[PDB]
Design a protein around this ligand. Sequence first.
Ligand SMILES: *[C@@H]1O[C@H](CO)[C@@H](O[C@@H]2O[C@H](CO)[C@@H](O[C@@H]3O[C@H](CO[C@H]4O[C@H](CO)[C@@H](O)[C@H](O)[C@@H]4O[C@@H]4O[C@H](CO)[C@@H](O)[C@H](O)[C@H]4NC(C)=O)[C@@H](O)[C@H](O[C@H]4O[C@H](CO)[C@@H](O)[C@H](O)[C@@H]4O[C@@H]4O[C@H](CO)[C@@H](O)[C@H](O)[C@H]4NC(C)=O)[C@@H]3O)[C@H](O)[C@H]2NC(C)=O)[C@H](O)[C@H]1NC(C)=O
Ligand SMILES: *[C@@H]1O[C@H](CO)[C@@H](O[C@@H]2O[C@H](CO)[C@@H](O[C@@H]3O[C@H](CO[C@H]4O[C@H](CO)[C@@H](O)[C@H](O)[C@@H]4O[C@@H]4O[C@H](CO)[C@@H](O)[C@H](O)[C@H]4NC(C)=O)[C@@H](O)[C@H](O[C@H]4O[C@H](CO)[C@@H](O)[C@H](O)[C@@H]4O[C@@H]4O[C@H](CO)[C@@H](O)[C@H](O)[C@H]4NC(C)=O)[C@@H]3O)[C@H](O)[C@H]2NC(C)=O)[C@H](O)[C@H]1NC(C)=O
Lengths: 208, 208
Amino acid sequence: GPSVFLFPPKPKDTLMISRTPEVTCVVVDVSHEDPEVQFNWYVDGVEVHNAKTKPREEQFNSTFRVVSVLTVVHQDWLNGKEYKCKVSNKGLPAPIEKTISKTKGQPREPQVYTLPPSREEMTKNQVSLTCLVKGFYPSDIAVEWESNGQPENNYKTTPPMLDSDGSFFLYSKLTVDKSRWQQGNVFSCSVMHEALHNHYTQKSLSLS
Amino acid sequence: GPSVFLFPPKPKDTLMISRTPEVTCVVVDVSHEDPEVQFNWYVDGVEVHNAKTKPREEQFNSTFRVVSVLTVVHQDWLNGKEYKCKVSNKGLPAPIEKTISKTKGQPREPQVYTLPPSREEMTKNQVSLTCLVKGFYPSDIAVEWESNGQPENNYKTTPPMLDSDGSFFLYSKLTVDKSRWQQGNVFSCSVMHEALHNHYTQKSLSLS
Ligand SMILES: *[C@@H]1O[C@H](CO)[C@@H](O[C@@H]2O[C@H](CO)[C@@H](O[C@@H]3O[C@H](CO[C@H]4O[C@H](CO)[C@@H](O)[C@H](O)[C@@H]4O[C@@H]4O[C@H](CO)[C@@H](O)[C@H](O)[C@H]4NC(C)=O)[C@@H](O)[C@H](O[C@H]4O[C@H](CO)[C@@H](O)[C@H](O)[C@@H]4O[C@@H]4O[C@H](CO)[C@@H](O)[C@H](O)[C@H]4NC(C)=O)[C@@H]3O)[C@H](O)[C@H]2NC(C)=O)[C@H](O)[C@H]1NC(C)=O
Ligand SMILES: *[C@@H]1O[C@H](CO)[C@@H](O[C@@H]2O[C@H](CO)[C@@H](O[C@@H]3O[C@H](CO[C@H]4O[C@H](CO)[C@@H](O)[C@H](O)[C@@H]4O[C@@H]4O[C@H](CO)[C@@H](O)[C@H](O)[C@H]4NC(C)=O)[C@@H](O)[C@H](O[C@H]4O[C@H](CO)[C@@H](O)[C@H](O)[C@@H]4O[C@@H]4O[C@H](CO)[C@@H](O)[C@H](O)[C@H]4NC(C)=O)[C@@H]3O)[C@H](O)[C@H]2NC(C)=O)[C@H](O)[C@H]1NC(C)=O
């Protein structure tokens, strides 16, 4: 009894023409005696044929794992085109069909807010700078940090939370040596999200 | 083939003598033909006998569900005592054993920081006030908000995130009408966590 899992591309993959968005079709618990698999892909029901089917991998539990990767057009996904994977195995009476697309909902533009460390935080040798992203829909988003055009390393972001009003929000937290902050260095969280003009925005933060 | 799941109490249950901490032993996919179950509980291997075993509930998939609830002593769990559930069913060749205890690790005191809304946020009719809890271990924690001793309603908190240094942190976000904030009302996130003196602390925030 095999099952299939269908993964969407990653947000910023989608948002940057530069990047390569992929839809991933994963089939597990494939019969170890009859490992032969057939993938079929569809774009709004339209069969396409450009998917790279990876070599089957033997797992440690007497099953195989089978991955099919479809390259997608940025705009296509953005315009909410459907991607359906069909998987046909001889040890299964009917082929499995999963489908995925950009989540159905009105797009909503993220509001970004930079926030100092707390007065009391100025006790410790590390401070936390606070990026705040809210109101956005869907959930698919990415934040980064940087200073002097160079990306910062020591930050962490939450996974998006559902807000009362059906929007999502999240916080990003960049920690830095107090000295940097007090020297008046400028830092900015950058946010990628389909609702943004050019899918990107930057909001800066430095000690007043 | 039944399975068991063993749930810990909830943080603040543990932290307030007032509250009632419970350890929950859940057994699912119990045979619909042979539904007869036997629970056994243990405190550091020591069998106790004070658990309330709930009536078995027929599920919609031809299985039963069986819950056993053990009341625990606040200090006991706090001192990291072990709670092992044994489940014995006739349709299973060996009884299932799960065990749980306060997570193993050095306790670490949460640092709480209140943070204004962003200057730019003062555009909208709703603002966000920002409670920040960091450095804590373990993860089991709870935040609330209040003003004028009355609990606030419209806030949301993230689930704890793992921080670089093996600590957890999280943010709480309380939204309020701009007018309240500009009137100079005082708001404070309150945090319950075992590392706190008296398991509690409060940090306030009002417009300067
Ligand atoms: C033999 O050993 C095998 C290898 O270990 C093992 O295979 C594994 O099988 C499980 C199923 O039991 C399967 O689990 C699914 O995982 C989905 C996410 O997979 C992630 O994360 C894991 C680890 O965290 C990674 O190892 C995977 O590679 C994968 O990572 C992603 O991979 C893709 C491409 O490779 C990347 O693009 C991603 O970036 C990357 N992510 C990360 C974080 O790195 C998970 O979503 C599945 O959840 C759904 O099914 C569960 C039941 O299995 C339900 O509990 C749950 O509710 C989900 O249901 C769905 O919910 C959706 C809404 O959220 C709906 O849309 C769906 O309709 C609904 N239901 C479905 C589809 O049923 C799931 O947990 C693993 O993927 C798989 N391992 C690998 C490596 O492929 C075998 O089980 C072993 N067999 C036996 C018999 O023991
Ligand atoms: C027939 O229909 C039945 C009823 O719907 C159904 O029963 C369900 O079976 C599934 C297993 O498939 C079982 O899922 C487990 O759920 C655990 C959490 O349960 C929560 O959340 C659900 C919904 O979100 C609630 O409905 C539950 O009541 C329960 O809520 C909690 O309940 C307790 C007491 O009631 C409260 O105190 C809590 O406050 C409350 N929570 C909330 C949010 O309200 C989940 O933790 C389990 O995860 C582990 O097993 C998975 C495999 O099933 C793994 O993918 C996963 O990795 C986990 O593995 C563990 O990881 C741990 C570390 O994190 C380790 O410690 C463990 O060692 C390791 N492994 C284990 C134990 O295997 C799990 O998903 C449901 O609980 C159960 N439903 C109910 C209502 O009890 C049947 O499946 C149906 N049968 C069939 C054949 O279809």
